Every structure is written in C-alpha cells, then in structure tokens.
Amino acid sequence: PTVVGRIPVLDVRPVVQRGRRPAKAVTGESFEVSATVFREGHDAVGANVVLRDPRGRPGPWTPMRELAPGTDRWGATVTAGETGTWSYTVEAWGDPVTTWRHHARIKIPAGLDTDLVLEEGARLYERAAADVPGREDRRELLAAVDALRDESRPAASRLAAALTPQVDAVLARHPLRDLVTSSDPLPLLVERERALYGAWYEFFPRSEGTPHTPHGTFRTAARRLPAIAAMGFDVVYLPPIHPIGTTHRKGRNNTLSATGDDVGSPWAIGSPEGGHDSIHPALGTLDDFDHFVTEAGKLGLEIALDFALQCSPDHPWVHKHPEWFHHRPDGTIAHAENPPKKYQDIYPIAFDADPDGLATETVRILRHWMDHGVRIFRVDNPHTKPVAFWERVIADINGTDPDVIFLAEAFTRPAMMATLAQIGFQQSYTYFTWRNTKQELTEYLTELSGEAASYMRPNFFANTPDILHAYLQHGGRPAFEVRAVLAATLSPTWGIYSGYELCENTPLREGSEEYLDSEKYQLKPRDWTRAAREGTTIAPLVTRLNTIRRENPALRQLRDLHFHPTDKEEVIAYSKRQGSNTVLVVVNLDPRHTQEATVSLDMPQLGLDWHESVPVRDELTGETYHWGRANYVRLEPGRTPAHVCTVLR
Amino acid sequence: PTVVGRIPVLDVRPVVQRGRRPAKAVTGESFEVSATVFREGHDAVGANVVLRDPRGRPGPWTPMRELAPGTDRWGATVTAGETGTWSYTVEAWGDPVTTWRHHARIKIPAGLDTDLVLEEGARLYERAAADVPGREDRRELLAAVDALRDESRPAASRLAAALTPQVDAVLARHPLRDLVTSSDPLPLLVERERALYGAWYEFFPRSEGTPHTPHGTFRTAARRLPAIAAMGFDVVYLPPIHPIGTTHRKGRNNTLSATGDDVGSPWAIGSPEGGHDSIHPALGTLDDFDHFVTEAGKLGLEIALDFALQCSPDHPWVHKHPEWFHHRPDGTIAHAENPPKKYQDIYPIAFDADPDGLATETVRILRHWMDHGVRIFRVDNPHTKPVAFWERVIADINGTDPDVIFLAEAFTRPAMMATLAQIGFQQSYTYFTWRNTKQELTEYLTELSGEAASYMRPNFFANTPDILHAYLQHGGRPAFEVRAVLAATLSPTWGIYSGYELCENTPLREGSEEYLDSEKYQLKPRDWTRAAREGTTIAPLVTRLNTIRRENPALRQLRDLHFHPTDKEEVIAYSKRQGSNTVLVVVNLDPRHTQEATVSLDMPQLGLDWHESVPVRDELTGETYHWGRANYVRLEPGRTPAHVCTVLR
Ligand SMILES: OC[C@H]1O[C@H](O[C@@H]2[C@@H](CO)O[C@H](F)C(F)(F)[C@H]2O)[C@H](O)[C@@H](O)[C@@H]1O
Ligand SMILES: OC[C@H]1O[C@H](O[C@@H]2[C@@H](CO)O[C@H](F)C(F)(F)[C@H]2O)[C@H](O)[C@@H](O)[C@@H]1O
C-alpha cells in the first residue's frame, strides 16, 4: 500500500496540527481549500473539493484551478453551511479531454493524422457521456461524437463540433476524470456566525448607579443597554459579577490597601457571600441578573461573562479545596503575578493535585451561567492555566452546547496564543492595540487574514481596562476615531471598553498603559447625557461604523483583505470583498497632521481593469467619488479620520 | 484524551508528508531535531531529544536549547549511527530548579522571606537527589540541601552553596524534570554513506575500444577504470548496457535515420538479442560484465547502472506484453517525447493495464543486476512514470536490500522533484547546471542545504550527455575549472560525464545544450594518453578536489553551509563545517577576467571572534594565508579559479 496515490494530491490545506485539530469556519463563511496536484508525464490534471456535511452529504461540484503558473498548487473556494463537524477531501484526476483538445487544436489545422486524432476525440467524448446522468446532456455529447466521426465533413468542421459552448457546459459540470485519487479527509468545525462576526461593548454595572446608591445594580445598569444597542453593538461583556474578597483588597489606582468604601477589583473573586456561582450582593440577586439578561436579549444583545479561574483569599475554595492551590512550606499561598505586574489580592489555581475536580467544577460553573442565558465567556488570562485543561473544558462544554463561545484573553507569546485557538478557543484577543504604524498594521493583518484564519478568530478591542495605548494618550480624539475605524473595518469582530467613546485617555503616569483612577478599583460614574448634548463623544462614529458593517458583507468576514500602495507612510489603504460587495478604506494614521496622498489601487484585485474607474460612496459622509488606478486624498484629523467607501453598482 | 499534553510539545521537525514518510540521514550525519515547547505561567521549561535505533535503544542524554529568544522553538543536534529505521521523540518538561534559582538570586539579596525561599530550594534539591544514580552525585546534592537548611548561617552563603559548579555539573547530567511530556515518535531512515557522499563518473564503455575493434567491450572498458579511480571517483555510472534496437535507430548527431554501422542510442533498449536483463552483444557476455565489476571493486569503484523503463520497437516486450504500451486506434505506439525533444527510437511504457506485471518484472530485472554486484541505479526520467510505481518498486527492493541506492534523473518542476525524493529516491539530480551566477547559486544552495536536506540528497553533475551549459561553451577551460570547484565543494555528491575534463564544449548549434557529435549516437574514442601528456586536461584539478574532499569531513556533508559577503558580484564565498574541520571557499565566477575582491567573513559563524584571525591553507596551491574579518583576494582565470582553504589547527 503506497502513501502516494495514482494521481498525487499532497499537502491539503488548511490543516491544523497535522490533522489532529479541526480547521475553523462559521456558517456562510468562504475559504480556500488548496493542494499540490500533478501527475507523471505531460498530460493535464484536474482537481475538485468535496466538502461533506455532518451527515456525510457532499456539497456542490467544486472544481479547482492552478493558483499560479508552474507551481502545481491548486485551489477552490468552499462555503460552510450549518454548524457541526464537517470534513473535506481533494480529488485529483487525469484530465484527458483538456489534453486532447490542446493537441487537436494544433494537429487539425496542420493536417497531422487528422482521422486518428478525431477518432481519439470521439472515444473520449463517448467515455465522458457514460458518466453523465442527464439524458439531454448525454445526447449533446453523443452528437459531438457522431460529428467527430463524420468522415464526410471537413476536419476543421468535425473538430469545431466538439468545441461548442453547449458541449463545454456538459463537460465543465461532468468532466471525464481518469484515475481519480483522493486525499484523506480533514476535519472542519463550523460554528455560529457570532464566533467570527460581532461588535463588543465592555462596561462595569457597578459604575451605573444613582445619587443615593452610587454602586450600580443589575436593575440600574440595565439602563445602559438601550444606548449600547443604539450604538450597534451585539455583545455586552461584563467583568466578574461575583462577590469580591476583603483580604488584601486593592485600593484606588492599584494601591495595596483598600480604605473604607473602596470597592476592590472584580477579578478578586470570592468571599463568605459566595464564589464563581454567586452574584455580588451589591449588584443584586440571580433574579435581577435574569432580568438584565432578558432586557439585553430584547435589545439584540448577548451577554459575555468574565471567567477568571482564580480566587481571592476569602473564596470558599481556599478552605473547601486546599489542594487546588500551591502551598509554601509555612502553609501560605503566594499571590498571583504576571511580571512585573503583581496581583496581591488573588491566589492562582494549582492544577496538578486534582485536575479532575477542577475540571468538573469548572464546567459546573459554566453550565450554571449557561442556564441563565450566558452563551459567551471571556476567559481571563488562559495562558496561566494548562493548555490541556482548556482543551478538555471547552470540548466538554461544546460537546453538549456547541453554540457556546469562548474568548481567549491571552496577551502572550505567539506560540501560546495560536495553540489556545487551535485547541478550541472560538476567539482570541490579539496584538491589535500594539500595532499602530502602517507597517505594523499591514504585517499583522496579513498574518491574521492569512493562514492563521484557519484556526484563529480575532477580536479587535481598541482599548480594554488595562490597555490605554500611548497612541490614544498622545493623539486625543482624532486617534480614537482612527483606531475605531481600523478595528471596525479590519476585523469582523471588534470591541471597545466603556469610556472609549468619551476619549478618556489620561494614563496612570507617563510610560504606563493603565488609566488614571482606573475603573478596576473605583466606581466611575460618567455623564453620558451631557457628553451626547455637547458632542464630546464619538458614539455617532461608532454607531455609523457598526451600521456600515451590518450593511456590508465584506466587513463581516476576515480572509478577504488586500492592502493597496500609497505614497505616504502615514496613510494606509485596503479593501475587503464578499461576493459583489466591495469596501475600500483609506486611513490617515496621523492623528495630529493633515495628510494628502495618492492611493494606487491594485485594480485587478478589486476585479476591475486598470483603465476603469468606479463610483464610490464614502459611508462616513454620504459624498460620492469616482476612483480609479490612482486617487488623491486629503485627510484632516478631527474632521476626517478616514474614507470608508463602498463600490457602487 | 486531549491532543496536547501536560507540557505542550508541538510541530516536531524534521517531518516529511506529516509523518507518513521518513526523514533521511546517513551513518555519521548530524542534523537538528526541533520542536515548539512552552508551558503555562512563567516558570522555565526544558526539553530533550530521544533518538531510538532500529532495536528501540535510546541514545544518550540530548538536551535542547531555545534557538531564538521569545520564539519557543527548541533544538538539538543528533547523529545517526548504523543504517535502518530509527525514530525520534521530543520530551518536554517543567524545569523547577532553573525556576527556583532565578527567583532565589533575586529574593535573597532583597531579604524577602529568605528562610522560606531557601527551604523551598532544599526540598527541590532533595527531590533531585532521590533520582540520581551516582552515589557521589547524590551526596553532593544532599550536601547542598544541608547547607541550604543551615539556619545558623547567612542567607547569601546558604544560597551560594546551592550554586556551585559541582552542583551545576550534577544537575546538567541529571536535571529534575517535572511533568515530562512526549511527542509521538517520528520515523528516520538512516542509509549508507554513499547515499549522501560520493564522486561520480559517467562514461560509455563502447567508446573505450581499440584500433582493431573500435566498439569497446567490458574487457577493454575495464582498462579505463584505473584512470577513473586515480581521479578520485567512487562511482562509475554506465548508460544502458543492453541490446539496442534497429527500428527507427537514430543516426549521428541525433538524425532520424541510422545508416551502415551507426551504433544508435543506448537508451533505445531491446532487440531479439534480449532486453533489460541482457548484455549488448558487442559489449560481451555476463562473465565479461562480472570481470568489469570485479576490476571496479579492486579500484574502490561502485557500478551504477542506468535503468530506463522504456523500449525500442524491437524489444521483446512489445509483442509479449502489448498492454504495457499505449496504442492508438490504428494499433501503433506513439514514440516517447520530452517536448520539444522527440525520441523517435523508443516507446514509453503504459502502467495502468498491468501495474502488477510491470512492478514484478521491474524488481526482477533490478535483482538480476544486483546479484551481479550492482547496488546503485540511475533511474532515467522517473517523472514520466507513476510516482506510486517508484514508491512501490523502491520499497520492494530496499525491503530485502536496504543498501541499494536509487538516483532520480528528474529534471522537472519542483513538486515532482521533491516528491520523488520523499517517496524513496536516495539521491536526486538538481537544477545545478542552470545555477551559474552568485545569486543563483546562493539561493539554490540555501534551499538544498535547508529543509529539503531532510528528504533530498543532491548529486551535482557539472555536465551530462544532454547538458552542455552555455557557461561552459563561452568560458572554455577556466569555466570548467570553476564548475568543478563549485560542484565538488557545494555538494557531498558530485559528478562529471567523460570529456568534461578535456573541456569539450562545442555545442550542436548556438543556443543548444546538446554536444556536437554526441556520444549518445556515435563511438567517441578519446586519446586519454595524449591528453595527459599534453596537459590539455583538468584531470589533475579534479583529482585534487576529490583528495580535498576525502581529507576534509566538512565537504562530506550537506546541511552546514554558510555564504559570506564579498564586494564583487563575480566572486562568491562560503564555508562548511563538521566538528573541528572547517573549509572556506572563494570562487571567481568570471572565466574571462581577473577579479579582486574583499571577503568579509562572518566570524561568529566560523566559531571565531570578530577581531580574531586564523591560519588557512589554499589546498589547490599549498599557499598559506592569515584570514580574518576582511580579506583581499585576487583571482585569475586559468591560474587561480578559486581558493579552497582549510582552517589550520
Ligand atoms: O483582582 C486581581 C487583579 O485584577 C486586575 O487584573 C486582571 C488580571 C488578573 O485577573 O487578568 C487580566 F490581565 C485582566 F483581566 F485584564 C486584568 O484586568 C487588576 O488589573 C489587578 O490589579 C488586580 O490585582
Ligand atoms: O534512445 C532514446 C533517446 O535517448 C537519449 O535521451 C535520453 C532520454 C530518453 O531515455 O532520457 C534522459 F533524459 C537522458 F537519459 F538523459 C537522455 O540521454 C537521446 O538524447 C535521445 O535523442 C534518444 O532518442
């Protein structure tokens, strides 16, 4: 038994961990299946992709083409349908009809062995007709056969009868395939739309309180939900909603000792009041939570809860399950770290004394919140827990509830980030916030939209409670507008942390990416009404970007992305396409100076000829333009961060 | 059962077709095994390579190192021993001692609960001691344990006692490994030295005849062997030695009609005198062949026979096995092509009617010649036969006779060239002859010496009966000198086709790569004795190159090769290393003009400091130099084509 088949079909992609983990897609998402296909001798090959659904049913006829001359690399686009575990194969084959046509087209005008050549053509078309199911199609081919054999017609006429468009149509759909050879099937995990596409909004319920009761509840925080939905978001992500420890509770601005009314960090989970399956008593009850979830649902918002597998020193687990922690010789548990950051208010979990107990309890907790309508979890720092632990937990949860989405908050080295996605995380945080120059952005998104897209779905948060980039610090509102445009148009999933709209950008100190008076350690009431009235919010820009995304399919996918040359380092241009929808974006990365540039569009990449010019509408302003191979732009920060254009019919 | 283990160890390389074919080596050859290794959290990892021989026996302790900071890619060099099928795995582990040392070196000077840190180190060293077999090593570690625990001593000195070199030595030999995780085993095929290293000489026995009998015999051809051994060759490759057909026999200079005593192409195999298992009547008998093989052995020369699976029209197979050929509707068999080259004198084989019969007869023929001492086969145009056919044939033969070496003469596209090597071919012809500028050679050898070396062993023929490159045509003798130096020093296997050393360079016509009056179609008597007497031969240079290769282990391997910058386009520099042997080569690629250049060596790549300088000897001349960071060279065509220097010790 040979490893290589009759007609070699090798190195089928996409592939994850040599086939041990599935490649990823979502419903309706297109992606390219490719392979290395060739044969011995000089005759032609063909190839096609067979995508099988969870019941094993093959999809449509999907012929491949060679992707570049001389490479023997073949590819075709396939589209994922319903959710579940799919599989795909590549089939390679001798293509004798293409070979014969190429030869016949030369030998017949030349008068070389024309009777022999034409009879050879007849015998091929006969064999082709054998595997054709439709009688009318069979007759079309038999007609070509009989004309090929009609020795009373001129040679050129006999040949032309075999090359009609009606003949071609039958053969494109039902080619004569010699020596059909398959690859072994590769697995494909198809998940719901929201795993790839969605806009995310993060906020702290406790900050949305009242004059008499500053600490918000689920009842009072539910009042933010309409504004969040009105901005076009689809997911609300909440920091931990559990009780917060008192022992070593942190004070305002990440100081070591809390005083008086200090609320502590939500990530210091657990107290006598309860742990990960409990509600912070100042937020209300489980019933209040259900109400909040119902109200979010009515507005088209899904809740994403923070899952942080760690404990305050006051968490029940500390005495109920001591072996879930590493104890030093004197009995103490060292507080967690993420150097040079220190987390004195929490203990990390130890996994090697009782991995089964931890896993059982972890999925019990997740299933608790799932029963209260939470189908998305934002997983805090998963790279500090064992990789195989997440693999097991996610397979367990998705085994009964495949719609549950896990988002990996792993800001770490590339190997770990990729692995966490590959072992099951539906979504990943990225390096987005640390990619701000044109080169950084171009390089990173080429990586994300390239091969990584077969296992990773990026969630572009333009800020988070722990990340205020110096770009925003130094650039002010024009920088906030640029990052929102970039995040919203470069990834099918993006997000902001509340306060981004107001352009909050005062850091803890120079050189830090922490906010001053961080909301992690104090209530932060914000005057939303005033900001709206005084126009000191970019909420209208955020709203518009999400509307443009909702209306343009090209912006709801990841893999089709192309960067176009510009003659200015500060100006970046790119396009994305999905079917007949084409979006073209031009961004001035300079938040402080006006930039004019020439944008030289890669026209064949837009599916246009170099001479052509197309109508475009800038969806940020309503202005229309006619663009071609080279277009002038002038972008004034404060007035215009970018052009976000749809190509018009 | 999770796909990732406790400590992630991923993407072990080398790997060939995802583990379905083995990576390759030869006895004594070193190469890097690598993997992606990391863990959760911030603690240290360690890794090591377990190389197992054909009987399952593990090699010595082989710890890996991270190859580049922040990449989590780890590697180690291993060395292949005896021939057979080996396996390798990578083991990954938590390295608690490295972790503890790093923490202790910081915390002890700062006075941060030092009693606790030191008691944690004592318990680690206690664990580490329990496993060490050596009783002297054990008491050394437990001595450090006691020092660590002596509370009556200063903290710094308690720690310092755990960091002594004699403690380091023990733990380098027997580290404490936590949570040991292993990759799945990958296969390694180890083959004999000749598969990677050897110098080849191609000649036609019929051309080495006599005045009274111009058509050479095996007995007269044997008298040519001493001069071939004296040039330092190891392998003598003979074109087909079988009867040659008369039907459509080609005439001199590849004319379509043979006349009179035209001997025809040896590749037009078969007549009623016999086929692939027979000897051409004019060469003699099988006994004569045996004499020729015996004489070759006496001189340290192995025979490589040409295997060409194709037939003249007079081959007995044509009527005995008509289904081994593709017939046209009129019953005729179209002659072979390799467009636009036409081979009117032969029929190609068809494989899909009786593949079992063809495979069976093929290995029978090979085994016949193997019984007569032929353990190397040069396989003619394997890419016009099914890839799976060769995979089967090569597995069948190497199954009983693993020492047999197959060389693929596949001048074709890269995917097929690579696949043929991957499915079993021990050696491959290459694009070498069409790589003549510094960039071409640099790029091509970077490819060959990189990842491809895990499955492909290159045989650098500077010429063949079908390839007289324009570089040789225009450059004359000095060009022949350059190509010999390049071929012999860039690859551990190289070869020439006879007449190369006489600098035969007259093309069939301008822009052709065929020789005028090609030996493929006529007897080519060469007056070797006169060429030697008159010095009109570069045989002494060839002899010198082969002696240099025999005396310098660096030139007998492929993977270690580094190119060094020079400030002249026409001058190329490179180095190769194997243990303490280093060879530095500088070549003037201009065969018509003298070239002066500055050669800026990458001293770190030579294992030297940037300021340092080292004694070298140019093994072509005997002249000694002192070379360092930047060296002047002056290379003069016909006098000094190159420097071939060994670094002196
Ligand atoms: O309360 C513990 C810890 O909470 C925050 O740190 C978070 C950290 C630990 O869970 O994990 C991620 F990095 C995060 F969620 F992004 C952080 O917010 C506070 O920053 C930290 O000071 C506090 O000690
Ligand atoms: O005798 C047939 C054929 O022999 C030579 O061609 C060889 C070819 C066909 O076997 O395969 C390789 F490419 C080779 F061995 F390198 C060729 O020498 C002659 O060139 C050709 O003219 C002749 O018809």
DSSP string, B149-166: H-TTS-HHHHHHTTS-HH
A555 and A572 belong to one structural domain: no
Give me the residue from B39, B120, B385 closest to A40, CB to CB.
B385
Q: Helix (H) and strand (E) counts for chain B?
A: 17, 29
**Cβ pair B116:A329 closer than 8 A:** yes
**Cβ pair B423:A4 closer than 8 A:** yes
Which residues lie closer than 8 Å to A515 by C-beta, 6 or more apart? A465, A468, A499, A504, A506, A507, A508
- The residue among A53, A51, A46 whose CA lies nearest residue A78 is A51
Q: What is the C-alpha to C-alpha distance for residues A633 and B249, in angstroms, rounded to an integer?
A: 72
A516 and A585 belong to one structural domain: no
Please, where are the H alpha helices in B17-134?
A: 96-107, 114-131
Q: What is the C-alpha to C-alpha distance for residues A427 and A457, in angstroms, rounded to an integer?
A: 5
- Given a contact cutoff of 8 angstroms between Cβ atoms, the answer to whether A591 and A538 are in contact is no
Comparing alpha-carbon positions, the chain A residue that sits nearest to B72 is A415
**Which atom in ligand 2 lies closest to the alpha carbon of residue B346?**
2
Q: What is the C-alpha to C-alpha distance for residues A634 and B191, in angstroms, rounded to an integer?
A: 66
Q: Which residues of B touch A451 (CB under 8 A)?
A: none
B317 and B212 belong to one structural domain: yes
CATH code assigned at B526: 3.20.20.80
Distance from CA of residue A447 to its chain's centroid? 12
Q: Which residues of B touch A6 (CB under 8 A)?
A: 352, 386, 388
B84 and B157 belong to one structural domain: no
**Cβ pair A17:B3 closer than 8 A:** yes
Domain boundary among A108, A138, A173: A173
Note the ligand closest to the C-alpha atom of A248: 1
- Number of neighbouring beta carbons within 10 Å of residue B633: 21
Burial status of residue A154 (CB atoms within 10 A of its CB: 0-12, 13-18, 19 or more): exposed
A488 and A625 belong to one structural domain: no
A581 and A485 belong to one structural domain: no
Annotated catalytic residue A361: no
**Which atom in ligand 1 lies closest to the alpha carbon of residue A341?**
22
Domain boundary among A533, A559, A585: A559
Q: Whose CA is nearest to atom 9 of ligand 1?
A: A267
B337 and B225 belong to one structural domain: yes
**Which atom in ligand 1 lies closest to the alpha carbon of residue A465?**
18
CATH code assigned at A618: 2.60.40.1180
- The verdict on whether residue B345 carries a ligand-binding annotation is yes
Query: Coil, strand or helix: which one is A647?
Result: strand
User: Which of the following is catalytic: A191, A380, A504, A619?
Assistant: A380
B226 and B338 belong to one structural domain: yes
A85 and A48 belong to one structural domain: yes
**Token pair recorded at residue B383:** 């890419």
- The residue among A474, A464, A441 whose CA lies nearest residue A585 is A441
Q: Whose CA is nearest to atom 17 of ligand 1?
A: A466
Task: Give the minimum alpha-carbon distance from B381 to chain A in angstroms, rounded to a whole number.
Answer: 10
Please, where are the H alpha helices in B323-375?
A: 355-371
- Number of neighbouring beta carbons within 10 Å of residue B612: 11
Residue matched to tokens 């509770």: A249
Residue B618 in contact with ligand 2 by CB distance below 6 A:
no
**Token pair recorded at residue B485:** 């130096």
Query: Coil, strand or helix: which one is A116?
Result: helix
Which residues lie closer than 8 Å to A167 by C-beta, 6 or more apart? A125, A140, A141, A144, A161
What CA–CA distances, in Å, run from B72 to A340, A400, B12, B501? 20, 35, 12, 50
A117 and A83 belong to one structural domain: no
Q: What is the C-alpha to C-alpha distance for residues A326 and A233, in angstroms, rounded to an integer?
A: 41
What CA–CA distances, in Å, run from A312 to A72, A244, A278, B436? 58, 7, 14, 69
- The verdict on whether residue A521 carries a ligand-binding annotation is yes
Residue A406 in contact with ligand 1 by CB distance below 6 A:
no
Q: Whose CA is nearest to atom 7 of ligand 2?
A: B267
Question: Can you give the C-alpha Rg of chain A in angstroms?
Answer: 30
Q: What is the C-alpha to C-alpha distance for residues B63 and B65, in angstroms, rounded to an integer?
A: 7
Q: Contacts for B249-254 with beta carbons within 8 Å, 24 or more apart? A: B249/B312, B249/B345, B250/B344, B250/B345, B250/B521, B251/B521, B252/B517, B252/B521, B252/B522, B253/B508, B253/B516, B253/B517, B253/B518, B253/B521, B254/B508, B254/B514, B254/B518, B254/B520, B254/B521
B343 and B222 belong to one structural domain: yes
Query: Across the strands, what pairs with A583?
Result: A576, A646
Task: Give the minimum alpha-carbon distance from A212 to chain B in angstroms, rounded to a whole number.
Answer: 43
Q: Contacts for A506-514 with beta carbons within 8 Å, 24 or more apart? A: A506/A473, A507/A468, A507/A470, A507/A473, A508/A253, A508/A254, A513/A466, A513/A467, A513/A468, A513/A469, A513/A470, A514/A254, A514/A466, A514/A468
Task: Give the minimum alpha-carbon distance from A256 to chain B in angstroms, rounded to a whole number.
Answer: 17
Which residues lie closer than 8 Å to A371 by C-beta, 6 or more apart? none
- The verdict on whether residue A11 carries a ligand-binding annotation is no
The experimental method, as deposited, was X-ray
Give me the residue from A10, A330, A339 closest to B17, CB to CB.
A10
**Cβ pair B337:A42 closer than 8 A:** yes
Annotated catalytic residue A380: yes
Q: How many angstroms does the Cα of residue B646 sit away from the middle of ligand 1?
A: 60
**Cβ pair A40:B71 closer than 8 A:** no
- The residue among B16, B98, B14 whose CA lies nearest residue B51 is B14
The region, left, alpha or beta by phi > 0 then psi within -120 to 50, assigned to residue A204 is beta
Task: Give the minimum alpha-carbon distance from B413 to chain A in angstroms, rounded to a whole number.
Answer: 7
Q: Which domain holds residue B14?
A: 1-94+174-192
Q: How many angstroms does the Cα of residue A522 sit away from the middle of ligand 1?
A: 14
Q: Which residues of A touch B18 (CB under 8 A)?
A: 15, 18-19
Residue A497 in contact with ligand 1 by CB distance below 6 A:
no
Domains in chain B: how many in total?
4
Q: How many angstroms does the Cα of residue B521 sit away from the middle of ligand 1?
A: 82
- The residue among A94, A150, A156, A153 whose CA lies nearest residue A122 is A150
- The verdict on whether residue B24 carries a ligand-binding annotation is no
Q: What is the C-alpha to C-alpha distance for residues A504 and B140, in angstroms, rounded to an integer?
A: 60
CATH code assigned at B103: 1.20.58.80
Per-residue DSSP letter, B537 = -
A161 and A187 belong to one structural domain: no
**Cβ pair B413:A38 closer than 8 A:** yes
CA angle B505, B507, B510 (to 5 degrees): 130
- Given a contact cutoff of 8 angstroms between Cβ atoms, the answer to whether A200 and A494 are in contact is yes
CATH code assigned at B54: 2.60.40.10
Residue B220 in contact with ligand 2 by CB distance below 6 A:
no
**Token pair recorded at residue B388:** 């799976």
User: Which of the following is catalytic: A91, A202, A208, A409?
Assistant: A409
DSSP 3-state percent helix, strand, coil across chain A (nearest 5) = 35, 25, 45
Residue matched to tokens 């008369």: B246
